[PDB]
Design a protein around this ligand. Sequence first.
Ligand code: 07S
Length: 269
Amino acid sequence: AVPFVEDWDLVQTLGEGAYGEVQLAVNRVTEEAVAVKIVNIKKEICINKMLNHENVVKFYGHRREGNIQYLFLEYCSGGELFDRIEPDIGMPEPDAQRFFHQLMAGVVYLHGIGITHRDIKPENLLLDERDNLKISDFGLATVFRYNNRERLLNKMCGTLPYVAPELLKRREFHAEPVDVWSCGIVLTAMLAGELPWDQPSDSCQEYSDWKEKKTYLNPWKKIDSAPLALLHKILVENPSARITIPDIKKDRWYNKPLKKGAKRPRVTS
Ligand SMILES: O=C(CN1CCN(c2ccnc(Nc3ncc(-c4cccnc4)s3)c2)CC1)N1CCOCC1
């Protein structure tokens, strides 16, 4: 229709991953911003075409140019959740709760359509212009439910400090408690500004201390009793005993009023 509307200028590097790079693209005509992932890949596109939710990075389409694959994705101007976490501090509890609510909304959605992300961490949770959280990077994602039949997972996927202990100890495991666990590690990072362990193994002193309930130690001593009680339900070694998302939604801290709405303009007299 309108000339030049299909032209995008690649203006800045957003990250240089394993596959390739992510560029910020700006439309020559409209100045609309999109993230272009320049490159597992066939599955990532297939999974992305299934996604439509306010807390999931939108997929606009893809184009193949010989050996190069281009994925046009929602640009999140707020960057990574990772950058909002102050090292050894975390962030204000109300901000962490709001991001946690948004993360649960995204995960409920994905699980509802039978998709597991398998690599939830603050580097993959992006923020838009209004600080709304969006789950990104479906490179490691997979279908765990098809035709209402659950498929047990067996592939070692994810990032060690975020990974659930059953991935390291069992041949097969249910997909959903694995994503719930990584969400608990994200919550810990938001509230304490540190990861509790290198990996959830009995060989990890920090992991053993957590199972022994030594909450007078870091990162736990920095976390208020209400969010810490939720973490005691999420970070449970037995995935069958671990809290499910419907129950996280019933948690006392999850439902605690803490955060005021966005700073809206106001005047007096
Ligand atoms: O402007 C900023 C923050 N910046 C830091 C860089 N920002 C970044 C960095 C990386 N990525 C993004 N945005 C993205 N949107 C979609 C992305 C994406 C990537 C892979 C897959 N699917 C989607 S990445 C945004 C944009 C915001 N600063 C002020 C405070 O000091 C640090 C710099």
